[PDB]
Design a protein around this ligand. Structure first.
Ligand SMILES: *[C@@H]1O[C@H](CO)[C@@H](O[C@@H]2O[C@H](CO)[C@@H](O)[C@H](O)[C@H]2NC(C)=O)[C@H](O)[C@H]1NC(C)=O
Ligand SMILES: *[C@@H]1O[C@H](CO)[C@@H](O)[C@H](O)[C@H]1NC(C)=O
Ligand SMILES: *[C@@H]1O[C@H](CO)[C@@H](O)[C@H](O)[C@H]1NC(C)=O
Ligand SMILES: *[C@@H]1O[C@H](CO)[C@@H](O)[C@H](O)[C@H]1NC(C)=O
Ligand SMILES: *[C@@H]1O[C@H](CO)[C@@H](O)[C@H](O)[C@H]1NC(C)=O
Ligand SMILES: *[C@@H]1O[C@H](CO)[C@@H](O)[C@H](O)[C@H]1NC(C)=O
Ligand SMILES: *[C@@H]1O[C@H](CO)[C@@H](O)[C@H](O)[C@H]1NC(C)=O
Ligand SMILES: *[C@@H]1O[C@H](CO)[C@@H](O)[C@H](O)[C@H]1NC(C)=O
Ligand SMILES: [Zn+2]
Lengths: 588, 251
């Protein structure tokens, strides 16, 4: 009969096979992640092979239904998410050359021999704490001269192959294929282009520039004292002094750039050690915070099946904090919890991922995901943003009751957050504008290094301590660049992280600035949030955003409001020093 | 009223409620079972208070009145489903179970009983025995069973009797495992049905009977029917035990 009615039947037949093969693969992956032994790798590969071959054949079947006749707009989304040819459109010969390139890049980055020192924790510890001008220059140049030198010829072939693969799938370039996640079509009034993402990414960064210029001049003016005569007040910060190998996070600069040194912060590790928290109470406190904001309880199987404490030396397991959703109503958390405030925060973060995965369990198989790629981490972060305010720790038994707070503490806190949040936005924006320019073809193959260090000085204000010719490949050192991952998810996660927080702090009727707003004991805010967690991917992300914040586009105004006291204090501190930088001064 | 009498059939054999509920092998939902229990005195209060049931609901019958009532026959339909679809076992519901598997009428006079059975009938690696119909041309009339394996011709081309593109086999098998959620865990369901006809009552109990008195204006209970009047030997209610006809006259 009609294509729409025959398609609804095909998808009814599909979801039933898919749910069971997916769960059979997730269980076999969990078994190896908790028991890192032999024979488990083979079951991991077999369960990941049957799923891949079944999905490949079912995707070959999906094509036979033309997509113009279908008008439902839900079956439209499932068939769109299924009919994508992916990389198979490339010929047989070049698909193994491309996968060989990918394998070689991952291998050449994972095993880097600097002599002999590897990366973790060989060069990372030198770069993060040496505080010697030349030792960290050797530890920087060595990596940029070995791992970046062995990846130069390969990335030139990776670019052209991925470009032809993206051109075959009706996109313009691989940059467009990446950009195509933030695309909504057919819903009148809510449409979004793939040319629209380049915009708004520029009219939001050109609106956050003043806070970054004042944070930069404060960091430079506080870094001039440590390294005596190597930094100049007009010039930019050399690249090896930014507290990280790639200068991605400025957090390690907080050991020097303390506004008020004497006052400490709210370290509550001793409070939990005193009361003998048994590495399980933390998750119960998280569950009670979620129960109080209004959402449903934890499923029973979570408590028995999940591994929440390292099994010891007899059983070894890789334990990077993770929340597992295995389908068929099965949820688990994998963490080696230890009694520290850091694990008290990560428990609420992972529990917010678990609470996001329970919401859309009613949706079909292909629509069980976040509205777009930058929504899971915003949800997981706002809960760890609210569960850190001193008022909340005061509500809980720890954090002894009186503890009056003063402003001199809130400036220390805000600057320790600003170095982490508003210091990585011009690096994410510059890196993801370089890769878009190189993929489009704007940067010829003879200007790859000459233009990177002209983006640096104009956007990030970071000069190089030794000039790099055309032969080098600096960006290929980063984990995301060489291993072929997207990077604009971290520019939108930060903005969504604070528009959610403003909207839900408003709905809780809190009065005062946002940096100490709490959400617990406010059922209305929880209902407001669950009204968008429930949709899953079935609705356009502009509609999913409008259900919480009230706008159809991403903004930067709430992020600026969060940092208003810090911005004023910095605007007063810098007046003796300079503001802004100059592109001419280079240390060499 | 001088004296009160209750007259019930003299049948003291217990009903096989231990065989339907504790059956060794429950049957797939698409081909369910039916057992007709007749000529039996059957207690329900102990069944009600067994307290092992996840869901015990009745329709058209009050939960406590059924302990002392007279029906002509009782049926029991026993099968296995997932936990989430138990909601569809009720009059006027829709889904893949109440359309192509088991359809109930609106005027239902029975009681739906359902209890989780994860321990008995789930195992590691999957329990793929319980099949359920997934594709059917038309909805099932109330209390009808279609256990055929016709190849669903979902489109326009003749399917010739083999599957492939657009020809789907209509029976698909449930996957049960011990680690699943509540929504995907196996519930065993028993649906009782009570039917009444003109025939002499056959499921009545339990309730002890009394003597029969005439020429006075007395209260009487024959086979669950209540009345107050003078009963005379011959508006005409047959005595169940001896099968006589006893007339009724207001006092
Ligand atoms: C949300 O409301 C609950 C009330 O149930 C608060 O819990 C009380 O917290 C205080 C602070 O230590 C205890 O002394 C009480 O015993 C707790 N229970 C009750 C019933 O009052 C909880 O603190 C509130 N949340 C916040 C963030 O204050
Ligand atoms: C881990 O794998 C080994 C390999 O056979 C097995 O003997 C052991 O029981 C596994 N661990 C657990 C907790 O089952
Ligand atoms: C699309 O089909 C689903 C059932 O598969 C239905 O619930 C939904 O309402 C349909 N969409 C529209 C716009 O009717
Ligand atoms: C995938 O390749 C087939 C081969 O002909 C083509 O018909 C189909 O349109 C391609 N898919 C897309 C989305 O272009
Ligand atoms: C669900 O949470 C409420 C509120 O704390 C609690 O009273 C109830 O016992 C919980 N139920 C389960 C099954 O966890
Ligand atoms: C607030 O912070 C400023 C920052 O130096 C400090 O001088 C002042 O004493 C603090 N307290 C008040 C009440 O202003
Ligand atoms: C079924 O078996 C249980 C367990 O032995 C028993 O308690 C019960 O009386 C039996 N009959 C019914 C109707 O549940
Ligand atoms: C039991 O009922 C039957 C009905 O046919 C009757 O014949 C029999 O005498 C009764 N037995 C008694 C009342 O003890
Ligand atoms: Zn996370």
């Amino acid at each position: 009969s009609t294509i729409e009615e025959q398609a609804k039947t095909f998808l009814d037949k599909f979801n039933h096979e898919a749910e069971d093969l997916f769960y059979q693969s997730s269980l076999a992956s969990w078994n190896y992640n908790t028991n890192i032994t032999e024979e488990n790798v083979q079951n991991m590969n077999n369960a990941g092979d049957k799923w891949s071959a079944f999905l490949k054949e079912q995707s070959t079947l999906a094509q036979m239904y033309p997509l113009q006749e279908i008008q439902n707009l839900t079956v439209k989304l499932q068939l769109q998410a299924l009919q994508q040819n992916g990389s198979s459109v490339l010929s047989e010969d070049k698909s193994k050359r491309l996968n060989t390139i990918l394998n070689t890049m991952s291998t050449i980055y994972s095993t880097g021999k600097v002599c002999c020192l590897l990366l973790e924790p060989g060069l990372n510890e030198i770069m993060a704490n040496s505080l010697d001008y030349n030792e960290r220059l050797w530890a920087w140049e060595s990596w940029r001269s070995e791992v970046g030198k062995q990846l130069r010829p390969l990335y030139e072939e990776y670019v052209v192959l991925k470009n032809e693969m993206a051109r075959a799938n009706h996109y313009e370039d691989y940059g467009d294929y990446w950009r195509g996640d933030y695309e909504v079509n057919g819903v009148d009034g809510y449409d979004y282009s793939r040319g629209q993402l380049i915009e708004d990414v520029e009219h939001t960064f050109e609106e956050i520039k003043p806070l970054y210029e004042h944070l930069h001049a404060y960091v430079r003016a506080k870094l001039m004292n440590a390294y005596p005569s190597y930094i100049s007040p007009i010039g930019c910060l050399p690249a090896h002094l930014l507290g990280d190998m790639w200068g991605r996070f400025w957090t390690n600069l907080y050991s020097l750039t303390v506004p008020f040194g004497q006052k400490p912060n709210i370290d509550v590790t001793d409070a939990m050690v005193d009361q003998a928290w048994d590495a399980q109470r933390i998750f119960k406190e998280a569950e009670k915070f979620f129960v109080s904001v209004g959402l449903p309880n934890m499923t029973q199987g979570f408590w028995e099946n999940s591994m929440l404490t390292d099994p010891g030396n007899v059983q070894k397991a890789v334990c990077h904090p993770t929340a597992w959703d295995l389908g068929k109503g099965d949820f688990r958390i994998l963490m080696c919890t230890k009694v520290t405030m850091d694990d008290f925060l990560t428990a609420h973060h992972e529990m917010g991922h678990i609470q996001y995965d329970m919401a859309y369990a009613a949706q079909p198989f292909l629509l069980r995901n976040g509205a777009n790629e930058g929504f899971h981490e915003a949800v997981g972060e706002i809960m760890s943003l609210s569960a850190a305010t001193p008022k909340h720790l005061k509500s809980i038994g720890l954090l002894s009751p009186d503890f009056q707070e003063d402003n001199e503490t809130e400036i220390n806190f805000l600057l320790k957050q600003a170095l982490t949040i508003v210091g990585t936005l011009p690096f994410t924006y510059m890196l993801e504008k370089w890769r878009w320019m190189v993929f489009k073809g704007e940067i010829p193959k003879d200007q790859w290094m000459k233009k990177w260090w002209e983006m640096k000085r104009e956007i990030v204000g970071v000069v190089e301590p030794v000039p790099h010719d055309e032969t080098y490949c600096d960006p290929a050192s980063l984990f995301h660049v060489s291993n072929d991952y997207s990077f604009i998810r971290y520019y939108t996660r930060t903005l969504y992280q604070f528009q959610f927080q403003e909207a839900l702090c408003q709905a809780a009727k809190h009065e005062g600035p946002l940096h100490k707003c709490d959400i617990s004991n406010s059922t209305e805010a929880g209902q407001k949030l669950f009204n968008m967690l429930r949709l899953g991917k079935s609705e356009p992300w502009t509609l999913a955003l409008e259900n919480v914040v009230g706008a159809k586009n991403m903004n930067v105004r709430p992020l600026l409001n969060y940092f208003e006291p810090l911005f004023t204090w910095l605007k007063d501190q810098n007046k003796n020093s300079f503001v802004g930088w100059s592109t001419d001064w280079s240390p060499y | 009223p001088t004296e009160s009498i209750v007259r019930f059939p003299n049948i003291t054999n217990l009903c096989p409620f231990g065989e339907v509920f504790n059956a060794t092998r429950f049957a797939s939902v698409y081909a369910w079972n039916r057992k007709r229990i007749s000529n039996c005195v059957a207690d329900y209060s102990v069944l009600y208070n067994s307290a092992s049931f996840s869901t015990f609901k009745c329709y058209g019958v009050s939960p406590t009145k059924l302990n002392d009532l007279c029906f002509t026959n009782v049926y029991a339909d026993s099968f296995v489903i997932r936990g989430d679809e138990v909601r569809q076992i009720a009059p006027g519901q829709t889904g893949k179970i109440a359309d192509y598997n088991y359809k109930l009428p609106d005027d239902f006079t029975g009681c739906v009983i359902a209890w989780n059975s994860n321990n008995l009938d789930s195992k590691v690696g999957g329990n793929y025995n319980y099949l359920y119909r997934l594709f059917r041309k038309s909805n099932l009339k109330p209390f009808e069973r279609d256990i055929s394996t016709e190849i669903y011709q979902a489109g326009s081309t003749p399917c010739n009797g083999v599957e492939g593109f657009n020809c789907y086999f209509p029976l698909q098998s449930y996957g049960f495992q011990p680690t699943n959620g509540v929504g995907y865990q196996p519930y065993r369901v028993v649906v009782l049905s009570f039917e009444l006809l003109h025939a002499p009552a056959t499921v009545c109990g339990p309730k002890k009977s009394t003597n029969l008195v005439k020429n006075k204006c007395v209260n009487f209970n024959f086979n669950g029917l209540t009345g107050t009047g003078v009963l005379t030997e011959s508006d005409a209610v047959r005595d169940p035990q001896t099968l006589e006809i006893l007339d009724i006259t207001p006092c």
